[PDB]
Symmetry: none
Subunit: 91 residues, 6 copies
């Protein structure tokens, strides 16, 4: 029954690291995707000006930049990691 328990707890560690790396990637993805979204939006404005400094005014009906929010997800994963913590000893 030690091999099971040991294999078990050994698997939980592995799992938590998996979700840990995932949450990290998620965090790294929101950052880049958003950083680029801002670069894009800020580019739209710098264009609306120079196409006027010269109708050459942009069509924003199809120039809508979206931002990503993964806080809800990353928190839920953190709960899972924490919950998994609830499965170990007791002899």
């Amino acid at each position: 029954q030690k091999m099971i328990a040991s294999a078990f707890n050994n698997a939980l560690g592995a799992i938590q690291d998996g979700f840990d790396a995932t949450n990290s990637a998620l965090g790294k993805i929101q950052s880049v995707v958003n950083a680029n979204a801002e670069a894009l939006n800020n580019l739209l404005n710098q264009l609306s000006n120079r196409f006027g400094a010269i109708d050459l005014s942009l069509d924003f009906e199809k120039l809508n930049v979206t931002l990503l929010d993964l806080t809800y997800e990353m928190n839920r994963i953190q709960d899972a990691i924490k919950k998994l913590n609830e499965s170990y000893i007791n002899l």
Copy 2:
């Protein structure tokens, strides 16, 4: 043997929520990344016109926007969540 079984089933719930949040993030990521890709592509076309309304024609050899498709992934995760469902009772 209840603590094990209980710890086990307790861990599965946690796992499924982890993969659930992941699949959600994946869904949220395809949406934003694609939405922005379209905003970018639609911006290219609105530029090819105004650089002609004035060779100022863009170079699309390096202006290729790519779309992301995570359906294969999200489905596989849904299978995993479902499969995990196959490990619980039996006394």
Copy 3:
């Protein structure tokens, strides 16, 4: 004790597929997000030229494109998948 062990190993397979699909999505996300980042940056340069071929010079203080790197994450997940492999038999 077979049902437990069987349910266990049955759950590990499911888990590894979950992390496998995740790592795949991560790989698919870095690719698209980066591909689009390059399309965006290359668009900035093609613009700095045509706004000069006509101060209409862009403001790069807010035109900074970022690239995403998930190698650290994807490797850690691969370790988890491998580690999980360490929990199976022994009668």
Copy 4:
């Protein structure tokens, strides 16, 4: 029924933004047409004064021609459309 309410909500959000976009487009056309028409009227005014050099000197204290700007408005509606995007509900949640 959350899905229903949420699907219903996200559904109307789309419509609203489309509505606010259509208003912005509208406002852009108005600024273009009204200003072009003001500018032509202003040019008529300059030509008439010279033409009348044949006093028949027009009174400019009452021929004020205005113009532009709704871009403040344009941008304000543009933000609302963005903040509206931050309101879509994740049915998965």
Copy 5:
């Protein structure tokens, strides 16, 4: 061998797109050169008629000068390149 076949496939996809891009670039140069040359010929025609005002009146029923458009084509090839991108195989799958 899936990896092999897939790697081989993705590999040729790259080459094709590069091929279709090179064709688009080519077609763009042709529209630029042929039109510029048509336009210069057309201007020669207008100058000659005036010059000959010294009948030596040119017959324009047979001096038709055409021009432009391959952008339809340009865009068509541009799509193929995109739909080609939707075909790369995920070796991880």
Copy 6:
């Protein structure tokens, strides 16, 4: 303390880039002002030679007016800012 060191590091990275951006902006203004001023001086030179057509012929062997380029520099600093971005530390790691 890794977090501390890392937070401290990422923190200074921001400042550096801001610094390198401010330098690029600066260099852009200088190219704009110095060239505009060279170009005006050069135009003064062409006008003076004609004006003096009243020998009072200026010696151009010693009136060399230079100009432009810092874009090489501009781009070089622009890269450093990007490579700097590839250095931020993931505190989660």
